[PDB]
Amino acid sequence: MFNNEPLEQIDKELHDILADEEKRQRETINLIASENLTNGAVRECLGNRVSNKYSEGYPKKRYYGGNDFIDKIEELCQKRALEAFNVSDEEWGVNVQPLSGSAANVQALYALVGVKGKIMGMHLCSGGHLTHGFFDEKKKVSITSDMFESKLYKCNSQGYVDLDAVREMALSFKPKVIICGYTSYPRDIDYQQFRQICDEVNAYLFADISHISSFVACNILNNPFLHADVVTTTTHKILRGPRSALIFFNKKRNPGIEQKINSAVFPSFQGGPHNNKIAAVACQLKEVHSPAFKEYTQQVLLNSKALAKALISKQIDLVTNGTDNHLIVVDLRKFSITGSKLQETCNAINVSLNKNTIPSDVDCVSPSGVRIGTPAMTTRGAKEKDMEFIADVLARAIKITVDLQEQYGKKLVDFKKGLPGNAQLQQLKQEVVTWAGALPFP
């Protein structure tokens, strides 16, 4: 007693937008540092009937029977996660149930410290995530700043983590967790150094590697597994998986953490796992382990360096004047145009990037930059030679933005009126579209 008509027939209204979304993805130069493109295999999993099943609990300790095939899929995913991040299944545990990154971080933090618990993370302005204890004078913006007591550590005026300030803070604050690994940070992390500060106060070390996961797994960048009690990561960014999260816990350093973390995920915070996610994650984790995927990850940093170099060659300033990873942050103060202005201009030319704060911005009211990343375009087959063109399109967009701000004035309302119908934007869009539309598209 159901309607099995195909999506096109069943919902022509929704099917049209999705074809449109597909086309806009197909014709966009996507510089969002957190985005990527999933293959058909990962999307077959997300559409799989395995999402029908309720399977609260863990494998072999399931509330319901008839979870025979779900247990195999959940354990195959845990196995591949541990393998991919080069961890022994004797020494490291993994939870694959968190629905997304923010959920995983809140669950993992609660496990360690509980309500009223003390945490330290990077400020959102300085590169840290919302789930790293972010708050404001007006409000406790994240639950992580409200259900926990959190303190926030800034990066220096050059845009690097200042360990002296972290320790200065850690000794007076005495937290149970110190969070490292960030949302918009263009350099590698000194986890070893972090591990030393946590011991000095007996705090837990929490490494959120969602933006840099593929680097860590493929050993291009520092390994937080060597020092961290917990490693959280999303699966949908550089890893190129579905939207989900992973929590890693070091049993050897902390016996009894496995149950503490597993109970935090369920039944403290979630109900039934989403099984299509789990299957999809397993499917991507097979791909992560191959030497082919390391080739892809290498390519992301190659492109990111070439992009950074090419932007400096056009006299554009970068936070920390370069990058060790997939991402860059452009400091736009040189041109006296805000980040949101450039985001609007870039969308008009089908360039997806996002506005981003910089060290000089005391206040989040106006982000003075934009953040860009190479994983999505690396996925679409772009090589080092392609980066000069991207740098060129970005340079042209900044210039156009300066022109439109001059012509229509600095107010954002005023600026936006200038955007529609601009001949140069339409010319730039066309140029963007022709080049983007041609590239391989999973």
Ligand X SMILES: Cc1ncc(COP(=O)(O)O)c(CNCC(=O)O)c1O
Residues of the chain with a following break (C to N over 2.5 Å)? none
Decide: is 124 part of the binding site for ligand 8A0 (CB under 6 A).
yes
Q: Which of 36, 214, 244, 354 binds ligand 8A0 (CB under 6 A)?
A: 354
Identified catalytic residue from 28, 183, 233, 234: 234
Q: Which of 367, 373, 375, 418 binds ligand 8A0 (CB under 6 A)?
A: 367
Are 35 and 352 spatial neighbours (Cβ–Cβ below 8 Å)? yes
Interatomic CA distance for residues 229 and 112, integer angstroms: 10
> Given the complex with ligand X, which of 341 and 371 has the nearer CB atom?
371
- The contacts of residue 441 (CB under 8 Å, 6+ apart) are 25, 26, 37, 380
Tell me the closest approach of the beta carbon of residue 168 to its own copies, in angstroms: 28
| Ramachandran assignment for 5, one of left (phi > 0), alpha (psi -120 to 50 degrees), beta (any other) | beta
Interatomic CA distance for residues 90 and 21, integer angstroms: 44
Decide: is 233 part of the binding site for ligand 8A0 (CB under 6 A).
no
> Given the complex with ligand 8A0, which of 237 and 277 has the nearer CB atom?
237
- One-letter amino acid identity for 401? T
Q: Which of 133, 175, 224, 242 binds its own copies (CB under 8 A)?
A: 242
Residue 316 per-residue DSSP state:
-
Q: Is 234 a catalytic residue?
A: yes
211 contact choice in ligand X, ligand 8A0, its own copies, none (CB below 5 to 8 Å, kind-dependent): ligand X
Tell me the closest approach of the beta carbon of residue 328 to ligand X, in angstroms: 13
Decide: is 420 part of the binding site for ligand X (CB under 6 A).
no
> Given the complex with ligand X, which of 257 and 372 has the nearer CB atom?
372
379-418 binders of its own copies (CB under 8 A)? 379-381
Residue 422 per-residue DSSP state:
-
Identified catalytic residue from 43, 53, 56, 149: 56
143-202 binders of ligand 8A0 (CB under 6 A)? 183-184
Q: Degrees (nearest 5) of the Cα angle 303, 304, 305?
A: 90
Q: Which of 83, 146, 188, 190 binds its own copies (CB under 8 A)?
A: 146
Q: Which of 97, 102, 214, 379 binds ligand X (CB under 6 A)?
A: 102
Q: Which of 145, 357, 374, 401 binds ligand 8A0 (CB under 6 A)?
A: 357
Length of the chain: 442
Are 367 and 357 spatial neighbours (Cβ–Cβ below 8 Å)? yes
Identified catalytic residue from 80, 176, 195, 237: 237
370-389 binders of ligand 8A0 (CB under 6 A)? none
Decide: is 420 part of the binding site for its own copies (CB under 8 A).
no
Q: Is 56 a catalytic residue?
A: yes
318-377 binders of its own copies (CB under 8 A)? 343-344, 346-347, 350, 352, 354-355
357 contact choice in ligand 8A0, its own copies, ligand X, none (CB below 5 to 8 Å, kind-dependent): ligand 8A0
Interatomic CA distance for residues 183 and 210, integer angstroms: 8
Backbone angles phi, psi at 297, to 5 degrees: -65, -40
Give counts: helices (H), strands (E), the chain.
17, 13
Interatomic CA distance for residues 441 and 287, integer angstroms: 17
Are 289 and 240 spatial neighbours (Cβ–Cβ below 8 Å)? no
Interatomic CA distance for residues 438 and 433, integer angstroms: 8
> Given the complex with ligand 8A0, which of 118 and 355 has the nearer CB atom?
355
Are 230 and 207 spatial neighbours (Cβ–Cβ below 8 Å)? yes
Tell me the closest approach of the beta carbon of residue 184 to ligand 8A0, in angstroms: 5
Identified catalytic residue from 26, 79, 243, 416: 243
Q: Catalytic positions, please? A: 54, 56, 208, 234, 237, 243
